[PDB]
Structure formats: structure tokens, C-alpha cells
């Protein structure tokens, strides 16, 4: 018999992104080659099969620094991290291959799906 | 020029609620009289003007336990905490006064609004 506030989930995510911009309560640094990205472990797990696996691990859950595979592109990661916190994906011709490879590694199935459909349309 | 995934914010919130149920990465206990509620500080700040004020405070941000005013009803808090994590509000005739008073204290303006409209319709 509950009632539901339509915009609640979007409002929560907007405030989680504000916390990220101000660096409030971030508890992990993701290292992608020469670049560093601060984030909230809970948001990363909620968006990614890879981070969900990492942060449920009894040892890795307590790490303050996570290093990704050297093949991962920092811009691709940045675009996906922005997507996690906003629902918006900056998908461009110049970055689509890097975004798709990063989404496959991060296990972000909906992003992989769309990257596949956008590449198929161009061939 | 971004594209947007409509269900992303709802999917994030569903996974944050799964983390709460499994007690994963919860970093605070909210004490309401004889009852205790574990939660994520980031979600509490994102939903409530009161918790946003508390957890941006340079001293209170590091507390593992927060005690609410003894006038706050545990069921009212429980209903609002469930709302924070799901967008669903279990608003009933028997609990509406407690929910509205708790929402005013927690500074959850949209919940206060609706409680006001539901009471006005019954008078």
C-alpha cells in the first residue's frame, strides 16, 4: 500500500555526485595508469560487476587504493565513472572503442550493449 | 551530446538497499530510543537536510553512532529510512502523524508535503 516519489532515485544520485565533486566521504582511489579517481565504494559496487566482486572480497574491501589493468584507458574510465554518478554517457566516435573495452572490464552490461549497437550501426 | 540510461538511478538505489540489507559498508548506527538502525552516511546525507548538516560537520562526520532526539518515534524513523533507500513510503492512518513529525525533524521536505496534503484531505 506504499506511495512512491518518482524523482527520489535521481535526487539521491545527484547528491551522491555532489559528494564526489566535493570529495566528501570518498573511501577509495582508483588508479588507472598515471591517473587517480576518488569515489565511493558503495556507488562503484552498485554500478559495476567488477567492483561488486572486489569490494565483497574479505581482504580487498579494506583497501584504500585499487589499481586497474594497465590496458585500461583513463579517459574511458573517467567517462564510465561520470556515467555511474549521473546516468549520462558521453559516447563519441573518438572514444567508443575505449568506453566499450572499459565497460566490458568493469562488467557494466547496459553500457556494453549500447556501445555494440552504436558500432553495428556505423558498419 | 550525452545519451542517458533511464533506469540507472533506480538500479543504483536498489543495489544501495541490497548493501543495507546485507550490512555491507554501513558506516553509522542511528539510535532512536531503544532501537538501532545501520545505514550509509552518504545515503542519509543525500536524503535528509539534518544528516547532510551532521555529516558535513568536521567533528560529527567521524562518529560511528548518532543519537536522535528522544521525541523521535522508532517506527516513523524506520519508515523514512526505508523510503530513503527505495523511494517508497509506507504512509498509513496509524503512522502518518509520527512519519510527518520525523520527516520535519529529518528535513525531508517532499515527505512533509505529502503528509500535509494527506492530513488536509481527511479534515
Amino acid at each position: 500500500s506504499c506511495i512512491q516519489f518518482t524523482r527520489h532515485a535521481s535526487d539521491v544520485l545527484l547528491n551522491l555526485n555532489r559528494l564526489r565533486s566535493r570529495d566528501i566521504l570518498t573511501d577509495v582511489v582508483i588508479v588507472v595508469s598515471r591517473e587517480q579517481f576518488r569515489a565511493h565504494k558503495t556507488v562503484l559496487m552498485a554500478c559495476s560487476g567488477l567492483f561488486y566482486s572486489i569490494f565483497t572480497d574479505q581482504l580487498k574491501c579494506n583497501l584504500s587504493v585499487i589499481n586497474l589493468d594497465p590496458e585500461i584507458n583513463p579517459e574511458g574510465f573517467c567517462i564510465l565513472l561520470d556515467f555511474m554518478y549521473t546516468s549520462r554517457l558521453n559516447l563519441r566516435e573518438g572514444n567508443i572503442m575505449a568506453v566499450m573495452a572499459t565497460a566490458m572490464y568493469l562488467q557494466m552490461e547496459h553500457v556494453v550493449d549500447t556501445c555494440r549497437k552504436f558500432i553495428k550501426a556505423s558498419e | 551530446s550525452c545519451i542517458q540510461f533511464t533506469r540507472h538511478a533506480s538500479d543504483v538505489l536498489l543495489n544501495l538497499n541490497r548493501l543495507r540489507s546485507r550490512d555491507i559498508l554501513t558506516d553509522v548506527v542511528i539510535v532512536v530510543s531503544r532501537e538501532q538502525f545501520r545505514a550509509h552516511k552518504t545515503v542519509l546525507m543525500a536524503c535528509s537536510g539534518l544528516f547532510y548538516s551532521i555529516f558535513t560537520d568536521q567533528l560529527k562526520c567521524n562518529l560511528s553512532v548518532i543519537n536522535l532526539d528522544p521525541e523521535i518515534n522508532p517506527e516513523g524513523f524506520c519508515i523514512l529510512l526505508d523510503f530513503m533507500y527505495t523511494s517508497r513510503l509506507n504512509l498509513r492512518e496509524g503512522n502518518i502523524m509520527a512519519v510527518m513529525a520525523t520527516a520535519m525533524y529529518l528535513q525531508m521536505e517532499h515527505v512533509v508535503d505529502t503528509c500535509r496534503k494527506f492530513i488536509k484531505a481527511s479534515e
Binding site: C2, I3, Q4, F5, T6 | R88, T114
Partner: peptide, 4 residues
């Protein structure tokens, strides 16, 4: 607010 809506009836879900």
C-alpha cells in the same frame, strides 16, 4: 507522488 504516485501509486507504484
Amino acid at each position: 507522488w504516485v501509486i507504484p
